[PDB]
Amino acid sequence: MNAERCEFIAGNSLIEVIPSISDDRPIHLISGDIGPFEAGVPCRIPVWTAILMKRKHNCKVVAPQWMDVDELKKILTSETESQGLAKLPDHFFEISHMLVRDAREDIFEVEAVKSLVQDIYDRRDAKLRSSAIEFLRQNQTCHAQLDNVQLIEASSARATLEACRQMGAVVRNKHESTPL
Amino acid sequence: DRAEDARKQEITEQYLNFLDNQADTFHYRQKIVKMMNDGESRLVMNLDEIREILPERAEGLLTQSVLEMNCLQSALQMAINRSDVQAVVKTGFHVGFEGTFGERHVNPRTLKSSYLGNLVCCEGIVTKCSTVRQKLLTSVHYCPATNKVLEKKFADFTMLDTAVTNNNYPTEDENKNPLETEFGHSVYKDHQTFTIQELPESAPAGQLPRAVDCVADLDLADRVKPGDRVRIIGVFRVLPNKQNGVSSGSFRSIIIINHIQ
Amino acid sequence: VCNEIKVRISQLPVEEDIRMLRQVHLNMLIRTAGVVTIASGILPQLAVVKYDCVACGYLLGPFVQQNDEEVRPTICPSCQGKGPFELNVENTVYHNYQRITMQESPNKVAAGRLPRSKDVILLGDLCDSCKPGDEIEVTGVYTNNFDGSLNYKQGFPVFNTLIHANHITNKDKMASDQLTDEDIKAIRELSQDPNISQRVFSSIAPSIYGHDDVKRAIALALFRGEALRGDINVLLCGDPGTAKSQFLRYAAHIAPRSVLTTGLTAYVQEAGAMVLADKGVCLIDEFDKMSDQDRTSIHEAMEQQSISISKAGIVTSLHARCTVIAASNPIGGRYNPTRTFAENVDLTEPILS
Amino acid sequence: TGRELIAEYRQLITQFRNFIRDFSTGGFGMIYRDQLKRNYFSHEYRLEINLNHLKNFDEDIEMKLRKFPGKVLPALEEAAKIVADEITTPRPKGEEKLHDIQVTLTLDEYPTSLRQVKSAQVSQVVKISGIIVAAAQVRSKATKVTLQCRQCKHTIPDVSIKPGLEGFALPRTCAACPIDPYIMLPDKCECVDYQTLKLQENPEDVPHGEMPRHLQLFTERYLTDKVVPGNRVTIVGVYSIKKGIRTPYLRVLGIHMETFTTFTPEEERMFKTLAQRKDAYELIAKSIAPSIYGSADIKKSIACLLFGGARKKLPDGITRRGDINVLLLGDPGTAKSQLLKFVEQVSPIGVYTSGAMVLADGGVVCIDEFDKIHEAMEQQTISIAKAGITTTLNSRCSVLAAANSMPTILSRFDMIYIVKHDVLKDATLAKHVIEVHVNASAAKETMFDTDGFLTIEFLKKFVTYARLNCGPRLTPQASEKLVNHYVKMRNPPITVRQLEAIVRIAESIAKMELQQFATDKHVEEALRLFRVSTIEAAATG
């Protein structure tokens, strides 16, 4: 599992667009019907389909509601105050990076949105680092709780799994060395 | 302040219990008995042995070396006072160290300002020597006008003790009677300085070798000559300077020696 | 570009010797001439000063810096008190400064006398305008000031004296190596003629008769190979009185840049003859009368066309890319035709190569 | 009026914080933010800023930073500290202390000539180029100090000192007590590293027939120990006057430099391919000095000199030498110095010269003009006892010597050649050599080279590989031949020195093939080389 496959799974989310082309029938995808398209009237389609239309100039993308600057400030406030990881929308970082990559014309207040997302990422990264360092001093348990971790955050932190597997062998050796 | 006094009492008590444990596992009491039978005045300790029984003292003895070392020497004096043997020596008793240093094993090239105030161990070749000279420590005076005896103590930046005083030589009583020096009762110490340079097997090619200055007192004086290959343990420290109330910010640094190998 | 246009004044009618200045000429304008012996480096000096008032932040000044004073205020008027002072880094102004020493010319000294000397001060765009050894001529104001240590030295209330320079002419400035269209037309018209090679060869040193081999060697050595040394090196050996020095004198006349010397490299206490002759011609007489220090240094210089210097850890090298023409005498006072050139000349084969 | 200066200072800190946070190359690329985070987790408390990027972001603060650096630059360092705290919080336990960060600068402009720094440029940022000529030892400078009164023991803490070669003046009288009563505590002050350097102007820029000029440089913290004498540098710094005449110096804000023992599996496979080849020894001997004709046995001898024998120490402590020494005699021509220069280039460590004997531990020394030390050759040591000194200098090396011609020192050399009627063969050689020089004039107008010879960059690495890894021995059958050869030559000048020299040459030939053992083949080639070299001296003179 890696970051490309995380972005691949994040592509299945739904997002709203405004077409400029028009069409009569629906489109019968294996993942379900999406059409019909009328020019100037919004509708919801998958994110991969939205990016595919945006590259061909066939639509305009409408950003999610959580990309409002006030909503991002609320998220940053909750993340600053809470000791653990705060809850986020699904595929938050992946959808942010995909939309800044392919559709930054349609985002509103782009630099402020970008800076707030970078702030949230920075302090969540610091929280995960501190939690892993404090775990690796442990000897009494082999368990931790990591509520509201994102999939890409979990994917970036797989060294801890290998370290815990190495620690368990030495602990088992001490238990077998205890006399009777 | 009173919390600092309580902590110093605790640290001295811990070192005293280590030195004068009831059944001494490290035999430093028997080494104290050997020291007082031989008339010597400093005791050599293994920092690796302190590290086992009091690691919170041993690792703090590198970072916060001055206060810990003062507390240890005070504990040594109390441990000596518990003996039935008498303290003949008019200078106090002292401590030197040996063992594993790790981070603080250095060269004259790698001694830099991050290490100031720490205990260090350094290696090199002696390149200079001063002759041994005597330095005043305390002065004893008799007042013939009143039959009283006056005493005064002296201190210096090159000494481990941070305390400072006026350092004026006394000549008159508070009632302005004249005074007479008692040379048989005043206290002096032997003093020497030298320098060490990088070993030629370690200095990088083409460049000039770097060097460090050193101060040694009491039984550590008169032990070295030019050309000796030595390993030296002491505290790395900095010395301020003044001229007419204007100070250049560039200060000089030395090693105050505890032990020589 | 600027703040102020200076006026320099030249061709003042009355000249004085350094030897002849009296108390009459104090605060008068005078003109003298002589040879430079010592020159300092260029240093910045205070010109206009302002100070901070520590007590209330007020800026004191401007004070035009006088010649021999530490100008300071004593009272800040904005607080009417003797507040402490600091130098204002942001509003202080500097100018360039240099000091030289000038001696009487040896040609003008009378019988058995010693030449005198004076100190001269240069400010601004007069700095860096002359070297030691230059024949120069100075115009400036002759002034005096008190010095208590000079009083204690001489035992009488004597006064120090100086000249503040206002105009300088350097008599040793070489001509500009720039050509007009008339000069280039003359060069083209000369180069078109078929006899030009014999013209050049025979017209070098026309007073000396014969010795066309020496003339052609000098002529082809004044031009250079293209370059991988490009320089063409020539050595002459001959009996005394055979005019072997006149060739060096004519080469010194005609060469574009030249150093004429006699038996040479840099000196530590300063550039030597080959370093001064870099991308010029180095002419040496008495080449056989060298020392071994000269021989080793010159072998380094001819091998590398550059000379290395090391002193107390400081390590340097200098370029010495020059054409060498040298002259010498044979062993025993006269050449012997029963022996080779390498026997008649005492130089070794690594030098003669 | 201090609140106005406070307002200016806080405004500058706000603007520099905005610059560090908001500058971007497009997308999510905030380069200074990312660089600061990476440096802080790498435990390097520094940052580097480009002034043209700053000029594009905001022209006014850049112009102010150039013209008033001593006023404006601490605000930039403070802004960097604040942004680092924001980026890194919440830090793990034990790492709560916030560190202090040094800011350095780069600037894209033409440098100013060192002779043409105008006096109007004092206390301004300038860019200068030059050569480092000297470098002093690192020393300590105090940043913040604590003062105490001598008599009444009242204290002034955290008195801060301005940077550079500047002193500071103590208070004259007590704040709460004779003239100058304050003293400085040695234990309660803060210190940083500093270094002094000397810069020489480039020799290209010196006007004709003059000496170069010099300038003194001051460096601090991470800019110390970055340069060595001989380096070519460009420097950004503040032009200052040292504390009515003062000398100048430069306080450095940025330096820009204008300029073995480890191998890959590809390199190991290349070395082993050459060792696997049958013609490897002959190929290396051919590869030595291909521009110089002939001299096949001499090139083989130079290969033996480069590789050397094994080095031994028996249980009684008496060591046995591995080095090999070669001497060349005859006429002063025939490119002897060029051969010595080739060996100097190819050898892993080496020197050419006409003391010098000491300077090549593990290396090779080439001596020209040898007709201008016995202890040095045999014992690998020289000794002295003159008035007031006795020492010994010890160093291990091999020696190649060229002469133009003592019979005593011939015992110390393992191989000797006399170089010596060429004219008909020399006609063909003259054709080839002059064609080479005319082709060089036309020019004036990675195991193998184009002509099949080995390259210098591969050969040097291969020698450095082989010396640290091969270490051979002789086979018993190889040992059996030398005893009979020795007895036959001695009972038909034969000595144990010559016997050990032959053993060393056989080990050296077996080293090039990367062998475990030397054999009868290597012994026979060693005997051929020894006879061909040494018997010339027996026949001649």
Ligand SMILES: [Zn+2]
């Ligand atoms: Zn005022």
Ligand SMILES: [Zn+2]
């Ligand atoms: Zn006081």
